[PDB]
């Protein structure tokens, strides 16, 4: 219940499906070059419910991800899309045009969007992020340094409702505009019962 690797949960490593297996900074884990995010299978409802339960309990989460994004592009890292295809209830977008990490939350009929500034992740090079969300607070760590904070207009658990798995599904690298992720992703994971400090220390940071 501590680690939820999204690519592993979707089964995005099966042979022939919306992505291409490549190498990443982590020599022991598979990396995925996005070819067509639309074709990447959604996280099964049962596994997504486990995630929802974890977020509910911790009143937030710790999201880790390594990315090599195309310059000047808006790329959705992940999103909670409504099963009825009317939109997304939540999304994390690496906005290479604004040089920000955008967090969108739709708490019924209302789309609130907040940008985490000074976060240019869209550089043809590999970057690692640690996003810590607790209540209505967001703290972003890029690599072993840089902390940029932002506050949401509503608490994170307000999105992660009890039976969210019944109306939405978790998609990786897929957007609502034409914000599909362009580039390579690796180790996109939700981690619980741990802190960012605790985790910056376990990657060699200081």
């Amino acid at each position: 219940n501590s680690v939820f690797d999204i690519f592993e949960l979707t089964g995005a490593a099966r042979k022939g499906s919306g992505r291409r297996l490549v190498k990443g900074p982590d020599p022991s884990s598979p990396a995925f070059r996005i070819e067509d995010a639309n074709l990447i299978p959604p996280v099964p409802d049962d596994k997504f419910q486990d995630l929802v339960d974890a977020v509910r309990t911790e009143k937030g989460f710790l999201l880790l991800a390594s990315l090599r994004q195309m310059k000047k592009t808006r790329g959705t890292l992940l999103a909670l899309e409504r099963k009825d295809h009317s939109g997304q209830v939540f999304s994390v977008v690496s906005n290479g045009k604004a040089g920000t990490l955008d967090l969108s939350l739709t708490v019924q009929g209302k789309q609130h969007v907040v940008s985490v500034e000074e976060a240019l992740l869209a550089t043809g090079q590999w970057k690692s992020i640690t996003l810590f969300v607790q209540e209505d607070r967001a703290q972003l760590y890029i690599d072993c340094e840089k902390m940029e904070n932002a506050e949401l207009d509503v608490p994170i658990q307000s999105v992660f409702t009890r039976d969210l798995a019944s109306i939405a599904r978790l998609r990786i690298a897929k957007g609502g505009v034409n914000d599909n992720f362009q580039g390579v992703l690796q180790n996109v994971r939700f981690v619980f019962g741990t802190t960012p400090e605790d985790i910056l220390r376990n990657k060699g940071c200081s």
Side-chain angles (χ1 to χ4, degrees):
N1 348 305
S2 62
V3 176
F4 290 84
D5 184 278
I6 307 309
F7 275 123
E8 218 173 55
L9 296 182
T10 63
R14 58 191 182 173
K15 300 246 174 162
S17 54
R19 56 71 191 141
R20 220 168 195 158
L21 301 175
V22 295
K23 300 164 188 171
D26 189 324
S28 64
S29 75
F32 307 83
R33 186 165 229 296
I34 310 299
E35 310 230 284
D36 190 346
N38 289 354
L39 305 180
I40 298 175
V43 172
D45 297 348
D46 61 10
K47 295 174 179 188
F48 180 50
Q49 185 60 55
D50 289 342
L51 184 175
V52 176
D53 293 333
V55 175
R56 277 224 136 200
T57 299
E58 181 168 313
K59 295 302 183 131
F61 59 74
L62 193 50
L63 175 61
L64 286 49
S66 294
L67 59 167
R68 188 180 191 155
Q69 192 180 167
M70 181 174 281
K71 53 116 75 72
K72 298 176 188 180
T73 63
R74 292 173 207 226
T76 301
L77 304 189
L78 70 191
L80 267 35
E81 71 171 10
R82 299 203 57 207
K83 287 181 174 172
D84 67 5
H85 308 288
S86 58
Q88 303 173 142
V89 311
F90 178 65
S91 76
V92 179
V93 173
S94 175
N95 194 344
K97 297 192 177 184
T100 61
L101 183 71
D102 298 339
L103 307 172
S104 303
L105 292 72
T106 296
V107 174
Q108 304 228 19
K110 309 174 180 179
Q111 177 195 74
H112 300 108
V113 185
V114 185
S115 295
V116 175
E117 290 204 319
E118 303 178 345
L120 179 52
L121 280 31
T123 68
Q125 298 306 304
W126 278 107
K127 305 215 76 163
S128 174
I129 86 165
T130 299
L131 183 70
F132 185 57
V133 171
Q134 191 174 36
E135 291 292 339
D136 63 350
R137 301 181 303 278
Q139 287 188 302
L140 179 64
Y141 293 87
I142 305 176
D143 298 328
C144 280
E145 49 191 16
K146 205 177 203 178
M147 179 185 96
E148 289 302 328
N149 312 314
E151 39 193 85
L152 310 175
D153 230 272
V154 69
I156 192 64
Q157 57 269 47
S158 173
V159 170
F160 288 79
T161 61
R162 263 218 250 137
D163 311 318
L164 174 61
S166 196
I167 77 168
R169 59 184 180 182
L170 180 53
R171 290 284 221 142
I172 184 145
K174 183 190 187 301
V177 183
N178 292 248
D179 282 3
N180 282 3
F181 193 82
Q182 295 178 249
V184 195
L185 288 174
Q186 189 190 52
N187 293 353
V188 182
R189 309 168 169 180
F190 281 99
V191 188
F192 303 89
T194 323
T195 62
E197 309 81 353
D198 243 305
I199 285 185
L200 287 176
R201 296 178 170 187
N202 75 8
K203 198 180 182 182
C205 306
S206 293

